[PDB]
Amino acid sequence: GSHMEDFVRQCFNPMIVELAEKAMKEYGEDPKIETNKFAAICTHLEVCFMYSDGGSKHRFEIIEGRDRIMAWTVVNSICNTTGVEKPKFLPDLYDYKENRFIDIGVTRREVHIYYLEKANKIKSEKTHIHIFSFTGEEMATKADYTLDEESRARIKTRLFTIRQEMASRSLWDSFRQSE
């Protein structure tokens, strides 16, 4: 029974916590042992939902947060109706305005490096990438950041708050060093 586990449960809403637990169980991991991962998944989930909330109504299809089978079903529906190429890995959102898949990343390290490591790993030229860090930096494909500055600013504010809460509990160093 770790401090990080109870921190995560008292910091994130129950809907995110439950989706994160399901994700980890589907992968096969355990929230009680792999607790920095539990925190990372919750964080990613929240950011992806804050981000979809940044557009106009119906701008984004939300892929993140669904069961893997249903996630791919929706990806295939989008592909088969917009003629866009099918990605090799599951993205997080689809942008109906710009007609592209997006993969949002959240890193405790250098944005630059996480971006690159994401580009290669994706192996899907068409998928747009947008990285945020816990220090307030962001990096987007072709410097096209999708949302307006205010919607991104609130994401960054939220990440820095998570960082502080963790640091006040002496959990940050461990979370930072475990990426």
Ligand X SMILES: Cc1cn([C@H]2C[C@H](O)[C@@H](COP(=O)(O)O)O2)c(=O)[nH]c1=O
The catalytic site residues sit at: 64, 92, 118
Q: Considering the rule CB under 6 A, would residue 128 count as an interface residue with ligand X?
A: no
Q: Considering the rule CB under 5 A, would residue 92 count as an interface residue with Mn ion?
A: yes
**Cα–Cα distance measured from residue 93 to residue 100, given in angstroms and rounded to the nearest whole number:** 9
CB of 117 to ligand X, least distance (A): 9
Report chain breaks in the chain, C–N > 2.5 Å, as residues after which they occur: none
CB of 48 to ligand X, least distance (A): 9
CB of 23 to ligand X, least distance (A): 6
Q: What is the DSSP string of 7-38?
A: HHHHHS-HHHHHHHHHHHHHHT--TTTSHHHH
Q: Considering the rule CB under 5 A, would residue 103 count as an interface residue with Mn ion?
A: yes
Stretches 23-31, 70-78, 102-110, 160-168: which one binds Mn ion (CB under 5 A)?
A: 102-110
Q: Considering the rule CB under 5 A, would residue 104 count as an interface residue with Mn ion?
A: yes
Question: CA angle at residue 111 from 110 to 113, to 5 degrees?
Answer: 70
Residues 41-100 binding ligand X (CB under 6 A) are 41, 44
Please, is 162 exposed, middle or buried when counting C-beta atoms within 10 Å of its C-beta (0-12, 13-18, 19+)? buried
Binding site for ligand X (CB under 6 A): 37, 40-41, 44, 103, 105-107, 179
